[PDB]
Amino acid sequence: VRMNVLADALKSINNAEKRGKRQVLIRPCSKVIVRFLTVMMKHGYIGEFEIIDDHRAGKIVVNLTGRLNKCGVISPRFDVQLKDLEKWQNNLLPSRQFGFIVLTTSAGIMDHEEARRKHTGGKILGFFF
Amino acid sequence: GRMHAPGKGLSQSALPYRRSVPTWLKLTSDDVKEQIYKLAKKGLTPSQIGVILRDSHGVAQVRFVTGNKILRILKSKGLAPDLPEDLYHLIKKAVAVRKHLERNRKDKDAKFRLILIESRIHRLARYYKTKRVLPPNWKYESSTASALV
């Protein structure tokens, strides 16, 4: 069955992005996906998105640009310290200039660069570049 | 997919977005539930109490006209069944199939089904025991199941 709902959003986005579509539909909506998508906006990797609000787990329509290469989820959510953060970005990011790791901390869901500035690690969720 | 079948069907009910009582419905909450009580006195599971309400009286969902679901209405009044109706119908079906097997024993296919109904009972039985609606000693016995239909 459906065990992870973030893995279905990122995979669906990647399939539509890789084919040149302008809009994609994420079928289940969660606070994690919405929070993951806003981190994807502050760096200009996606446009603005809608949250269709039915009385169930809602849907999301995302305005896609051509600025995305691959968004991917990491399962299971490993616990990573700040000493180990350097290693993780050395395996699953293309180069030291661009690409971000999105991990959840006690201060919220945020990318690895801005998590390092406030000195707090957490659990990894995914990445994009 | 189905628990005990290879089919993957999609047929199901779709609740409308609006959850307010319609303007044409004049039956009110206080005089909805005593109709439920008298239909339960006839002898009717809550599944078929709501079936004959939304085709003959226009009350779509009692949870919207009344403040609670049908089974909560019955149990607060004291008319809830001894055991849940969904578990009841599995036991009634297992009795019917098991009775068919003693009449004719070469029915290998019918025997294979009997595990599937019985497996569903035990899976469902342990769920209700964690919810503390059946006693911890409640056990399904194929020999004595016939007495409680």
Partner: protein, 141 residues
Amino acid sequence: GKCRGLRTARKLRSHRRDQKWHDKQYKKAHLGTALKANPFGGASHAKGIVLEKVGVEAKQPNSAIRKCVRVQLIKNGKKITAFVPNDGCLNFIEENDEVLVAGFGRKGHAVGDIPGVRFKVVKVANVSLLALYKGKKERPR
């Protein structure tokens, strides 16, 4: 892997233990059945007395009579067939004398066109067979 859950450490490690036994190199190293069959007992070298001089025909695509020697290891008593390495060295070897025997390259595997030998003579009568070949030293008398 196949199972990826955060609480599947025992499943992953236990699966590895079982599947290492299907590795040929690991199976022989961690079962003694290979070491018992080894004449050397795991040692690199062994000394033995010469019992006979034997010549073995080479494999089919070649045509020669390889010069070998039958010895019985002192530490064990097992019979092995050592190969006299270099050209004409078999004359330095006589019957019933102590030789030093080592492996012949492939770690217990037949090597070259010589059929079914693992070992090689390196010293005779406590003097190196290379010194004899170069004329540096003579046999001890």
